[PDB]
Amino acid sequence: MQFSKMHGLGNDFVVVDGVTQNVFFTPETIRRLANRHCGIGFDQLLIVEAPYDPELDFHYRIFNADGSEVSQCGNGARCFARFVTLKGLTNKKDISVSTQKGNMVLTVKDDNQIRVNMGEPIWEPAKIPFTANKFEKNYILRTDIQTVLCGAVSMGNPHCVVQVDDIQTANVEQLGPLLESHERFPERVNAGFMQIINKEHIKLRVYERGAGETQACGSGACAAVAVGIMQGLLNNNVQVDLPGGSLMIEWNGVGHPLYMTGEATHIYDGFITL
Numbered sequence: 001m002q003f004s005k006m007h008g009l010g011n012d013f014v015v016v017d018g019v020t021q022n023v024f025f026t027p028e029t030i031r032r033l034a035n036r037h038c039g040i041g042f043d044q045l046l047i048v049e050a051p052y053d054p055e056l057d058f059h060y061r062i063f064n065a066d067g068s069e070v071s072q073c074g075n076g077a078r079c080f081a082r083f084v085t086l087k088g089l090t091n092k093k094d095i096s097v098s099t100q101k102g103n104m105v106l107t108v109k110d111d112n113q114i115r116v117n118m119g120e121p122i123w124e125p126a127k128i129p130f131t132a133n134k135f136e137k138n139y140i141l142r143t144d145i146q147t148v149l150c151g152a153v154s155m156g157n158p159h160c161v162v163q164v165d166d167i168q169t170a171n172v173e174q175l176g177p178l179l180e181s182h183e184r185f186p187e188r189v190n191a192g193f194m195q196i197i198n199k200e201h202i203k204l205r206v207y208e209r210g211a212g213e214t215q216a217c218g219s220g221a222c223a224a225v226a227v228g229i230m231q232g233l234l235n236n237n238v239q240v241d242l243p244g245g246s247l248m249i250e251w252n253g254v255g256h257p258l259y260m261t262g263e264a265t266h267i268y269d270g271f272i273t274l
Ligand SMILES: *C[C@@](N)(CCC[C@H](N)C(=O)O)C(=O)O
Pocket: 011, 044, 064, 070, 072, 073, 074, 075, 076, 157, 158, 190, 208, 209, 210, 211, 216, 217, 218, 219, 220
C-alpha cells in the first residue's frame, strides 16, 4: 500500500489513494499503524475513493487513530485537497467530494491555502446525535467533578462546545475525557473548550473523539464558531487560534454552508505491507 503523510496545523494524517489501489483494513491494523513508535504515526488516516455519485470528484473516508471510522475531518479535508492536486488525481480548483453523510467542496486557493465548504451545521439533537428533549442554545452536561454548559452541533461529526475564561487554565485534561464519552452523546463527541477574545477571534482546544487533545481540529473550529454565532456571541467571520496555528471560519447562519480556510502540507510518501 502506497500512502502519503501530511499535516494541517500539526494535526497529522496518513492519506491513501483508494482510487488506483484497493484499500481496506481492520480497526486493529489502523491502531497498529497509528502508533507513533511502532507504526507510521498519525492522528487520522484518510482514504480517497471513487465517487458513488459520478457527478462528484471523489468519496472521502476518515479513520481515527483508535480505529474508528467517522464522517468528517476539517484539517483532513484540506490535506485531501492538497493530496489529490499534488498527486494528480485532479487539477480542478473546486473539488467536490462525498462523505458517509453530506457533500463538501474543497477549493484550492491561489495562496495555496484550502477553503472548504463544510456544509451546513446540524442543530437537531437526534441528528447530532445527542440526547435532548428539545433544541437549546445551551445544554447541561453533568460530570463527576463539575456540571458544564455547552452548545451541541454536528458538522458531520458531533461536537460539544464549552466556553472558558482562560484557554490555558481550562481543565481540558480532566473535563475532556468526561465529556468525550458523556452518556448524552451516544456516538461520543469532540469536546471543544472556547475562549472568546472578541466577536471575531477565539482561542480553542479540542479533546477529540477517538484521538484526545491534538495540535488542531478543523471541524472543532467550525463547531465552536457555529455555536458562538448561534448564541449571538460571535460575528460571521472568526479567526480561531488552535495550539498548532489559526483557521478562518465563515458562516452566514442557518440555511447556509460553513466555510473553513487554512493550510495543508505534504510531508513524505511511504509504502507499507499490511
Ligand atoms: C480534529 C479533526 N481531525 C477531527 C477528526 C475526527 C474526530 N476525531 C471524530 O471522531 O469526529 C478535524 O476536524 O480536523
